Design a protein around this ligand. Structure first.
Ligand SMILES: *[C@](O)(C(=O)NC1CC1)[C@H](CC)NC(=O)[C@H](CS(=O)(=O)CC1CC1)N[C@@H](c1ccc(F)cc1)C(F)(F)F
Ligand SMILES: *[C@](O)(C(=O)NC1CC1)[C@H](CC)NC(=O)[C@H](CS(=O)(=O)CC1CC1)N[C@@H](c1ccc(F)cc1)C(F)(F)F
Lengths: 306, 306
């Protein structure tokens, strides 16, 4: 037992990380088959980042201007193209460490592991949620651009995120692996508004079920509620409205613990209205929203990958 | 910027994980060079776990009784020996994925990454501290025994922990890779007392410095204190006494932020005496003690591994 914020094992992704240098700019790229993916702003200088004309900047570049290094291995670039906010560098060698993989666009409230990298070298791994406002709260220093987010299902790596930016507010933005930003963000040095964010209600309830499975049960009460009454509380506390789709996804955890989803909603309502009263739940003094119901079932079941 | 509880990239360790089966018991082993390391209680049945005579149980076993599988690869066992609480299975093939590595015994209050594994297959990675009472608060289901803890310095993996037990209180115990338990624990199914635990003061102060570097500064105050006065507060709140050795280790962070260590101690004293007043620090509503000063400098500096 016990419950921790756990990331996927990073090995299959470590094998794909490279360094991409264009002129004086260095960041990370992802080497899959004979293609290297990286943020398009590798072609910019600090001067350019105000309002870059990426089409004009890339026209100045030839294949031999993109230096790609995997550890000591130098890769030969034989093609380049821009897709949305990413550059695709065709190389003459397929990555021998390419895992089974897909590209996916994740939904807000879904979770993924980030492999933070600098100069193509893995630094660390942590678990993130895509916020309702399409930002992530990561850990990314200058040079982390091109680090990727992913999930693993058995042997298949689903890449969902590439790091592009830190907003002046200190939060993080990036793209899917086709180079489309999550949220309204653009790859330029401007102040950019993120939506007002909300708490991911279905994830808090998943985590409450994780707490009960692990013997933290002090917050269970004598009460129940309705979807309608609960959503009035959710509104007041800036929580996502709970839908029957969310109730359905919580079905397995409700079945395991024997606690009806609306009974767990009545526990959450009391926690929102009264606070934690100086107590903790699974080592936390606030309501945690970065575990999906699938996360909770996986960690409670001991699912593995190859 | 941003600050997350980040684990080491797990790839070098994933390459070393195997399954070890003896009779009907299956758990994880660590394949380094031509030796597989695993918990000795692989040789027990549930019946045996009350008070196992491990010397007598191992005498009944021959090399061919230990089934070792790395993915599909079956390994040939050519020797076995018990060292303290671990079994060392000599195999006829050196692991080709063996990283540069050392075995280390970590000190209480130090941190490490855990690769949780089941049937020799990696499940997830998370960051842990060795508690002052030599327990860890992990996430370990039945079959996780033999999962390992580690740190990485550049290309060298320092193995510090192998998982052996969950205490009836739901906390976790294990050994170094020479098979010596951390703390007073024994590998048998008995109730076993853990020491009274304390909060790792030097780690809380490290994390306060991380908070200031990341722009969380609401807890900084007009006050200072002395080591003596601070330790009176530490006692009352079950924090480790702070020593000059701890002040010295905090020197780099004090230098970066320009906040004297005893000034940061006066912030911590006010936080212990007044609480957080419904506010957060780096996303936490309590005082976090699982980042070492070295952790904070690494994450703030972007150190990488190969
Ligand atoms: C990120 O884009 C990244 O890692 N880019 C490459 C250049 C490392 C990162 C996050 C915004 N950007 C920067 O770190 C960069 C600072 S730097 O050029 O000094 C890199 C340092 C390791 C040497 N900031 C530029 C930037 C802003 C916005 C953006 F979307 C991309 C880059 C800056 F400051 F010019 F605007
Ligand atoms: C752990 O020792 C482990 O993973 N061991 C091997 C057997 C998987 C783990 C934590 C205590 N122990 C158990 O999971 C085990 C339950 S089980 O045999 O049903 C394993 C299950 C996946 C099939 N508990 C035994 C045990 C207690 C204490 C100990 F130190 C080791 C084992 C028990 F219950 F018999 F005591």
């Amino acid at each position: 037992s016990g419950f921790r914020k756990m990331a996927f094992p990073s090995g299959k992704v470590e094998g794909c990380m490279v360094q991409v240098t264009c002129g004086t700019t260095t960041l990370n790229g992802l080497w899959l088959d004979d293609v290297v993916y990286c943020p398009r702003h590798v072609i910019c200088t600090s001067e350019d980042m105000l309002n870059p004309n990426y089409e004009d900047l890339l026209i100045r570049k030839s294949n031999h201007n993109f230096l790609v290094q995997a550890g000591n291995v130098q890769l030969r670039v034989i093609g380049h193209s821009m897709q949305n906010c990413v550059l695709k560098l065709k190389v003459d060698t397929a990555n021998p460490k390419t895992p089974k993989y897909k590209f996916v666009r994740i939904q807000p409230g879904q979770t993924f592991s980030v492999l933070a990298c600098y100069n193509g070298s893995p630094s660390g791994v942590y678990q993130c949620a895509m916020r309702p406002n399409f930002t992530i709260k990561g850990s990314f220093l200058n040079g982390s651009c091109g680090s990727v987010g992913f999930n693993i299902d058995y042997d298949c790596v689903s890449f969902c995120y590439m790091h592009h930016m830190e907003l002046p507010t200190g939060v993080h933005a990036g793209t899917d692996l086709e180079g489309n930003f999550y949220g309204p963000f653009v790859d330029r040095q401007t102040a950019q508004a993120a939506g007002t964010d909300t708490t991911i209600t279905v994830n808090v309830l998943a985590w409450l079920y994780a707490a009960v499975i692990n013997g933290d049960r002090w917050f269970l009460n004598r009460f129940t509620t309705t979807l309608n009454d609960f959503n009035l509380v959710a509104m007041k506390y800036n929580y996502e409205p709970l839908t029957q789709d969310h109730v359905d996804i919580l079905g397995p955890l409700s079945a395991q613990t024997g606690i009806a989803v609306l009974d767990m909603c009545a526990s959450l309502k009391e926690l929102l209205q009264n606070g934690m009263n100086g107590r903790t739940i699974l080592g936390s003094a606030l309501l945690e929203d970065e575990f999906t119901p699938f996360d909770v079932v996986r960690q409670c079941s001991g699912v593995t990958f190859q």
